[PDB]
Amino acid sequence: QIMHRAEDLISAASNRYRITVQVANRAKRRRYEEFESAEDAMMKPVLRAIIEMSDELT
Amino acid sequence: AELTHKRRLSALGPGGLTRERAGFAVRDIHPSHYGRICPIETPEGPNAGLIGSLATHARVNQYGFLETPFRPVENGRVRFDQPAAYMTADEEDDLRVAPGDIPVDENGYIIGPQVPVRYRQEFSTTTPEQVDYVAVSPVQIVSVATSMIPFLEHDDANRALMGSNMQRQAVPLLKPERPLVGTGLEAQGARDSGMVIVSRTDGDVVYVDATEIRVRVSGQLPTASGKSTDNGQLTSQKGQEIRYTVSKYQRSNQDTCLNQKPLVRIGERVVAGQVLADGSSTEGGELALGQNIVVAYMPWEGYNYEDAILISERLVQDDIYTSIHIEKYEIEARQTKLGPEEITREIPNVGEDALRQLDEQGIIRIGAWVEAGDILVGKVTPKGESDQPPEEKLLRAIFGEKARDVRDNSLRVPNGEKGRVVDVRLFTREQGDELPPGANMVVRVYVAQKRKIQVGDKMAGRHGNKGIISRILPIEDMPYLPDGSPVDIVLNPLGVPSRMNVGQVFECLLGWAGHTLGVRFKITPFDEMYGEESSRRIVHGKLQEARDETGKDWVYNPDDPGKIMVYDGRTGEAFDRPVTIGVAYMLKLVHLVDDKIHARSTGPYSLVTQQPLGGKAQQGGQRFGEMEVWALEAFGAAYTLQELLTVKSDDMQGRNEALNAIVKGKAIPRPGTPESFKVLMRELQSLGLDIAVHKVETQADGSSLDV
Amino acid sequence: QFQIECVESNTEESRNHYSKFILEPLERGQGTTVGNALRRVLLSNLEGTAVTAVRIAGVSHEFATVPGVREDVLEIIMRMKEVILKSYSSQAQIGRLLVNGPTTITASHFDLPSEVEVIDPTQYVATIAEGGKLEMEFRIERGKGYRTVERGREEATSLDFLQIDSIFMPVRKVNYSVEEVRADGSIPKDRLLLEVWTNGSISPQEALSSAAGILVDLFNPLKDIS
Amino acid sequence: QFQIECVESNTEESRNHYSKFILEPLERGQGTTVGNALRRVLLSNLEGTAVTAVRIAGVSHEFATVPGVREDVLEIIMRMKEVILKSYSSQAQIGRLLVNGPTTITASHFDLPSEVEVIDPTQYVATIAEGGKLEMEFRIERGKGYRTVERGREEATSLDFLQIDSIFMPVRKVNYSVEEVRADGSIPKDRLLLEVWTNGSISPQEALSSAAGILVDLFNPLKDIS
Amino acid sequence: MIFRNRVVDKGQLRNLISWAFTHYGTARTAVMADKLKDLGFRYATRAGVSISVDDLMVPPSKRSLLEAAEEEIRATEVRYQRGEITEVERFQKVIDTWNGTSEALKDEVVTHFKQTNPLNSVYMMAFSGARGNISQVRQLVGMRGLMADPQGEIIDLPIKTNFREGLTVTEYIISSYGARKGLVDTALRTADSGYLTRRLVDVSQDVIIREIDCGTTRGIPVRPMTEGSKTLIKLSTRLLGRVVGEDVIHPKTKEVIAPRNTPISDDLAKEIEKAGVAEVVVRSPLTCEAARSVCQHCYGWSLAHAKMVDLGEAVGIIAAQSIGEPGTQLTMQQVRSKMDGTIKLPRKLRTRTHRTRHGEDALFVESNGIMILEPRKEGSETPAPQEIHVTQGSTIY
Amino acid sequence: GLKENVIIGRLIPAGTGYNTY
Amino acid sequence: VSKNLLREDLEKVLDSLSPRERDVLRLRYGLDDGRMKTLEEIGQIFNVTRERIRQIEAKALRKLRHPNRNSVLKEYIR
Amino acid sequence: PREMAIELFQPFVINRLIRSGMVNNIKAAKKLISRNDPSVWDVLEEVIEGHPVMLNRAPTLHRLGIQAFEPILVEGRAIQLHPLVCPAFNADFDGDQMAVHVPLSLESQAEARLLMLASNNILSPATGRPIITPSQDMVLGAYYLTAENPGATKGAGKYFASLDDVIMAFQQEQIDLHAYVYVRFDGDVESDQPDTEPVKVTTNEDGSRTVLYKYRRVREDAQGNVISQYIYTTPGRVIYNKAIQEALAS
User: Fold this and answer.
1) Nearest partner of B550 among B488, B483, B481, judged by Cα
2) Is E151 exposed, middle or buried (CB count within 10 Å of its CB: 0-12, 13-18, 19+)?
3) Residues of chain B neighbouring A35 (CB-CB closer than 8 A)
């Protein structure tokens, strides 16, 4: 979906905040790393951040 | 309103009370209040319970004490033939005393086997022996709007208040309309207001020109009764002569507007002091409040589920529900002791596309359409470049041109100002500018617009109400009728039983009638006829015949004594249960999203805190609530907070930092540190404070310069 | 045969060709899928000649008087909507009008390009006193733009400048019903009705019955090839 | 041009040709009318073929067992409705079936006049044990009436008499919807995003496309001459 | 995969949602009860519903059973006349009266509805679940329970009806005072609601979890809050959002469980208290050793975590608001149960002693006790409509 | 004090970092 | 967020010339500076000139004006 | 709404539209702003989805009182929001006024991304209770659908595989949305009344032990087992109990 099944990863991964924070940490950089308008990053920096967490979070 | 506000009253007063040390009884009521002041009047604010309603009838004396009639009943016989009936000023009589109504037989004889009636603050029972004072009328406890309720007899008091204060400050409406339904007390009151004009004297109008009605210099028979049985300090001396100009749409003290209307056509007799002008809200000496509307209560697809109004686009096409407003804008010029400045007729970057519908000083042409960030007129200001900004001299000379900072903060009408301009009053040194000194010349001028109602319009009724609307809707999808017409106001249905305001039905109903058989009522509230649910009796009645003679005879069903059917689902099925509908008096308010809109992205901070500032302006602080900063940590994660103070409060270079970061593809950093803090610290340090504020991993800590 | 029976057909004050119309046998509610269909669509849209603009210039402005009026623009632009009219002109035109002298306005009394007519004259239109009354000129258009009062003849100033999304909608009250029926031998077939009315410009035949073919085509120009 | 764009097309195996379809330009949501109309129209005067009848010879009666069943006529007639099938035969036919021996019923396993096909075989149909199971014969019809079972083949006991009122419009699930797109300048433009499904006998390409006609003709087989 | 079929209510929503989210990813289930929720609409639509007027039905005893009450006074006051037996006194009756009969009057209206229209709008609002409640309906249909005057007593004139007929003037002003009262403090407890959880947050602030490892065997056990008769608190649901290290020993009929530590979870509850056992400790904060904080372990699942809270959060600041902030709703039977001249054991009634004097005359002596099913008055010992010999108390009003 | 640093803008304790440190 | 961009660009877009002038006259005799160290100084400070200031400066003083030179900040219109 | 859709992200908007080169510079590239073209408005939307927003009622009330939600690109001077919660904010709808707050840092979007947003709440941190619930208006749509009209009690023997068949059977009408048929479904069917009790025994041979269990009626089989089930309730009932499993997680 766009964002919905993401209610479990954070929910079940030790300290939630903590998660966030890293997740940003992704975020920030994993926009940052590429300022070449890579359309992968055409969408918001987080949401990727998330997801590729997500689907590595198996 | 200007009724009421004729005559509220208070005890706020130099003389008055605190507003918080005048603690309680102060606030309450007192059976003196009964007949002396209305309880349905209450701002329900921290400054309420302090607004004497002024007995609907009272009057007063040289000792201020007000009157409230006590109508005599000669131990069984009233008929109002007895004397007195005109005192109980501020107090009573120690006669256990007849409340307003009670089954008052034909010529009085006052059935009630054994009637309750008030001794002094008490209300014992006793029968025609011992009383004698009683209503003038069944409502000596109201204040201008608490009477609107057509049948408050049937609605809870706790319920009747703010709703009764809604119409008290109702918005006007381009095209007015008496109500429908009738309790009718008011017409006269409208005349008391003045919006509607009665002859000063008399006449039978000649040409009643919209601009000039006339027993004025008529030359004609508005004259002659304008001389009916003539009078002298009134110039009957010559074809009578009653000159006075009607009003157009003028900016009310609250930017409200109304232009009355030439009502009485020509040559049609008049009579002394009878309203002949149709102002704001009467056709004819009655209170134009709202309009009359079919109303099937109906929890359909939501779009409303308290509170929440739904209405059909028709309303717009109906050309009704059309505010208009007109409001100052003005502007002025100083004469700077910095080296005076004027308006211009332009300066740069002016479109004439800007500068065009402009006029001959810079001025803005009147009767001209405007729309959004429009331009009033040409301020010309001073702003030299002694300390030419670093680029300055050159850039100027470098881009290739040598302009000059003669400036111009000329007036740009706010965005969304799609209003044709509609007057101006305006003037300079010469009349003697009656001018705030130090200032050169007035620029005040302004505009209105016809503007139909929209969403979030605080529209409702006149008795325990408060409403707004989502969405409006295709004149067709909305539910309609077996006769075949489509209706035009849902509600919800649960609303009212809950509001415990029932009668809204009533009217619905009653009105129904009205509408089906053009029925008028203008009848005081409170079923007192026979002394029971006659109301009922009424309703079903005026139904009955109405539908009887309505031909189709469907608008009423014996099995639906007050209902109707509701075939009109999404594709117009039969909704199921025969649901009731009818005619209500939807009345809109001001709280128009327009003047009640608000949102902005930063701008001028304050001075002192240098924090932006929300006095509810175009750059109005998104206001702020620490009760939420006492609910924003329940999850913490600072960041938002951290920002959430900082950089939008203290840090200059923060805030800006931001601006950049994004448009600078940069990761907006890290707080500044607050400073207002430092500000607070400063005064404290002076108040007698000291702080070493500091690192400590530093050589024996120290005192980091946080100043 | 699945068929109209023209039924009761009125003949007076054309406005509302009171026209209860029937179709008798529609197997079941497939004919009810028509009533609404119409309902809407009928009052969806007949594209509609309607006065939209106004040239007064007695006041350029739109709230000032124009004397001799016993009634100003806010009731003069108001007395527009109510006007009633029609052209093929498919393109704008004007009427002007210079009565003067104390006068109603025989709605009739008018100013009349190509095919433009008081589909029914005699509307009260405008009071006046002996004073010179003033011209009133204005567009005329036939379209589905019976909504949105803003922009339009605004970006293009034209003096005596006002205009407004008129009604362009002749066909008002309208309705119907339905019922199960006999002929149950051939299924409990069943019946509808309707009324429409109309302003008395464009009788249902050229409105209701016209809407009939408005969609039949357009309901599905293609054969739902999807 | 007021036009379908066939859009996402995924018949999957068949049943529910999940078929979100689109008609982009609907000035105003009137597209809904066709939507809510065809909403019933798409499955209104259709001609779905289906059962009515059943010939459990040996068990004339309709509640007794018929052994080897792990599921009796009550569940045997129960397992009819679910069957799924089609003919042009426009006229009745039969299938019989004599499996025996312990056996499901490969829905497939069947008895097959004209087209009469397991539009999708393999429905579980009928348990059984090694014992002789017994014949099952029955009508087949096209129809559109799934409301009345009484006075069925109760009109003349061809055999067994037992006859159920079949339910039959392929599409059982469907999802019509509209959305006001942009192009609102000329006139608020809207588009109709809608599903149907169907049993996997007849996709919308032969269902939505039909109805489409079906009224276009029949909703307006005339300009309501009236 | 689990069909439910009953009627629906509020609550079974409520719960429902629960039981979903309780086992389903928040959003995954938070999103649920939204499409079917907005379908609440469209149906309700279709059924459609609304008032009538006489929607305001009146259980037509009303006339009667009322004037019944009317004789009540007739005797109280049209007979006290001799002063023989006296004024403040039955006075204390007549007022007693009105409210009493009145509840019986309602009680009519109670069943009256109950079996008037299974598809009743007025009923479909309320007893379903809706904005309608009981006191609400009372003074919608039932007589308006006599209240008080301007000061902490009730003016001679009492409340009187439902609306329908409407109101004469008197009571209306009497009620106007009632409101305006209500008004006014409505205001002032703004202040209260404000200070509530504001200075309380100032004490509930800075309390944060740091520690789970905290070794803690401390804590206090509960029984359900348990006024007298009535199970004041369920406990089978109350004891949740926490853990406990000392476990359950049901009559050794059963086997020990929730060993320690044990995140008291629901089932665990509803069973372990409704199932049969009734007492144990915990591990709550007034204990667990901690630094300017509480042992996580001495916390539990909060009331939103639906599972062991994380850590590093000013729980107190939120723990404050949850009390007075909503408490503002503070003042200053329905969904029909057995009857409503309510709980009472067998066979005598309370009369006071100087100041009722009409004969037949009394205030409100405190309940006596021993809850009897299908009430009758003051006694003990097993009556007929239901059978038991156990107990005391009474949700009686 | 979460609010102690709030008067400032140090972030608070009660935010990753208060323990991530 | 404007002026910094503008000021900074006033030199950050100084990129249509050789660095004989780009490095010196860049900021007139001042700019970014309080605003000055002048004609003399450069006369010495850079190429022991006194002429070359005016010419190479004029050269660059045009190396930006024919509208294509440094044609990325024309919106400036300032 | 649009009246406040422009401010609301101008920084991340102006940067965009330049940024992808649309225009260039400040106060002259944001030219289309005040120029009112489209290309904002869409691009604004293009950069508006996936941009979390938070909101607060005139009263901040509780922590769930300043909830966040995915802002919508609509036009108006009013807000737009989801009833379901009201109550949490309690924001009824009678002259109600609140405030469109917004994150600013990036990861402040996080405070909202997957921590602070409407989805991140199913029950007041207040109590164990899921305050969130279809309004009493919806509960009526639920209640009514679970009621029963004496008049409408048709459909005798109108049983079905309990799939959309009954829906159909309802898109069929001729049945009460409360006309209780007995519908198949061996799965756990919470029955209005006890359904595991000998009510109408019919235990015969070749299998069979056949008790009414009021709202459901298996017949059994000594060698076989239970299969009939026969959930005895209106299709409308199964209808209001079919869009549920799917709604939450099919």
Assistant:
1) B483
2) exposed
3) 665
The β-bridge relationship of strands E3-4 and H189-190 is: parallel
Determine contact: H87 vs chain D, CB below 8 A.
no
Q: What proportions of chain G, in percent to the nearest 5, are helix, strand and coil? A: 50, 0, 50
Q: Name the residue facing D147 among H159, H167, H174 (closest C-beta).
A: H174
G73 and H25 in contact by Cβ < 8 A? Answer: yes
Distances (CA, A) of B707 to B44, B608, B693, F11: 48, 17, 10, 20
- Residue B166: burial class (beta carbons within 10 Å; 0-12, 13-18, 19+): buried
The Cα–Cα gap between E158 and C61 comes to 63
Nearest Cα to Cα of residue C89 among C61, C49, C54: C49
Note the resolution in Å, 1 decimal: 4.5
Q: How far apart are CA C121 and CA C135, in angstroms?
A: 18
For D74, list phi and psi in degrees, rounded to 5: -50, -40
- In chain D, which residue's Cα lies nearest the Cα of B570? D36
Question: Which residues of B fall within a CB distance of 8 Å from D29?
Answer: 474
Helix axes A45-54, A16-32, angle to 10 degrees: 120
Measured CA angle at E91 (ends E87, E97), to 5 deg: 155
Q: How far apart are the CA of D36 and the nearest CA of chain B, in angstroms?
A: 7
* Residues paired with D53 in a beta bridge: D163
H92 labelled ligand-binding: yes
Q: From the CB of residue C113, how many other CB atoms can be counted at a distance below 10 Å?
A: 13
Close Cβ partners of D106 (under 8 Å, ≥ 6 residues apart): D121, D122, D125
Nearest alpha carbon to residue B313 among B491, B476, B492, B171: B476
- All residues at 6 or more sequence positions from E18 whose CB lies less than 8 Å from its CB, including other chains: H123, H129, H130
Q: How was this structure determined?
A: cryo-EM
Could you tell me which of B568, B589, B591, B546 has the C-alpha nearest to residue B490? B568
Question: What tokens were used for H32?
Answer: 């289309």
Q: B541 is written with which tokens?
A: 């009645």
- Give the Cα separation of C193 and H69 in Å (integer): 49
CA distance B186 to H39: 55
Minimum distance, in Å, between the CA of residue A29 and any CA atom of chain B: 9
Measured CA to CA, the distance from residue B680 to residue E263 in angstroms comes to 47
SS3 assignment, position B588? coil
Radius of gyration of chain A (CA): 12
DSSP percent split of chain H into helix, strand, coil, nearest 5:
30, 5, 65
Helix B534-549 / helix B504-516 crossing angle, nearest 10 deg: 30
Name residues whose C-beta falls within 8 Å of residue E298's C-beta, 6 or more positions apart in sequence: E214, E216, E218, E219, E283, E284, E285, E287, E288, E290
CB atoms within 10 A of CB D8: 10
Terminal CA-to-CA distance of chain G, rounded, Å?
A: 16
Residue pair B370/B418 in contact (Cβ under 8 Å)? The answer is: yes
A43: tokens are 């969408």
Q: Which amino acid is at E70?
A: E
User: Alpha-carbon torsion H175, H176, H177, H180, what sign?
Assistant: negative
Q: What angle do CA E264, E265, E271 make, to 5 degrees?
A: 100
Contact D212 C220 (CB under 8 A): yes
- Please report, for residues B445, C81, E97, E204, the alpha-carbon distance to residue C123 in angstroms, rounded to integers and kept in the order given: 38, 11, 69, 76
Chain H touched by D104 (CB under 8 Å): no
Closest residue by Cα to residue D192 from D217, D222, D212, D172: D212
Give, to the nearest 10 degrees, the angle between helix B652-663 and helix H10-19. Answer: 40
